Amino acid sequence: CGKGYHLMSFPQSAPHGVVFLHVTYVPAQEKNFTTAPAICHDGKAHFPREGVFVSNGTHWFVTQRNFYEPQIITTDNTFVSGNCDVVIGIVNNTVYDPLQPELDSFK
Amino acid sequence: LQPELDSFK
Amino acid sequence: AARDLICAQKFNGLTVLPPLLTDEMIAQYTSALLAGTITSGWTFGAGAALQIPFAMQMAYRFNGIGVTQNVLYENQKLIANQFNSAIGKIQDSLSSTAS
Ligand SMILES: *[C@@H]1O[C@H](CO)[C@@H](O[C@@H]2O[C@H](CO)[C@@H](O)[C@H](O)[C@H]2NC(C)=O)[C@H](O)[C@H]1NC(C)=O
Ligand SMILES: *[C@@H]1O[C@H](CO)[C@@H](O)[C@H](O)[C@H]1NC(C)=O
Ligand SMILES: *[C@@H]1O[C@H](CO)[C@@H](O)[C@H](O)[C@H]1NC(C)=O
């Protein structure tokens, strides 16, 4: 139903037929980025839950696949699976944890 | 969270 | 001296027209589709081509069947070897059997 990701459709009558109006979703403006499959932090491999790791040259972010919404890398949207000596192309970066500052502030 | 409490104590 | 049926079909008014798209253009369309689906994935069918590494869109394609993407990144070489062996077996099956 149309070109692109389908959103809605509307029917109309026609002489000996039907006519569909397909409302779709087409991405428009693109931008190059540098990506990595996983992040080696503290000897652990962090993989994104949903989205993809990108970088703007200096800092690393994680974003959704079909839109540029960069977020800081956190243990909430990444998960751990094994050591970082088996993934080809893994880079080095830190991963924020929101539990630790609140736990230190309660002390 | 309770091992973090054990390390807290 | 060995007359074929093609001249007899020709001499009775039964002609065969050539197709509009020659096989060179069909091969060009097939090569365009392969080069689109290798370097971009499903993105070249919606809008423009969106470049992505192959081992990352393969991990995207494991997420569509209910398998997490660490399975690829810890077993990339074995899956590549299995794909190459399957391609070679397809080649041998097409070379041997003509039916
Ligand atoms: C990559 O993105 C990061 C964050 O989006 C940029 O870091 C910030 O840059 C602005 C520039 O006006 C500074 O005011 C901020 O202080 C920076 N953040 C931090 C935490 O220091 C970074 O500059 C970007 N790099 C490139 C090359 O675009
Ligand atoms: C990305 O990099 C390529 C490298 O040749 C360049 O041609 C292209 O204009 C860049 N930008 C986009 C949006 O593809
Ligand atoms: C990441 O850090 C480890 C140990 O600190 C090091 O062996 C490895 O080379 C680093 N990665 C890169 C790409 O330099």
Swiss-Prot record, chain C:
Function: Subunit of the fusion protein that is processed upon entry into the host cell. Mediates fusion of the virion and cellular membranes by functioning as a class I viral fusion protein. Contains a viral fusion peptide that is unmasked after S2 cleavage. This cleavage can occur at the cell membrane by host TMPRSS2 or during endocytosis by host CSTL. In either case, this triggers an extensive and irreversible conformational change that leads to fusion of the viral envelope with the cellular cytoplasmic membrane, releasing viral genomic RNA into the host cell cytoplasm.
Name recorded for this polypeptide: Spike protein S2'
Protein's organism: Severe acute respiratory syndrome coronavirus 2
Lineage summary: Viruses, Riboviria, Orthornavirae, Pisuviricota, Pisoniviricetes
Gene label: S
Shown stretch of the complete protein: 845 to 943 of 1273
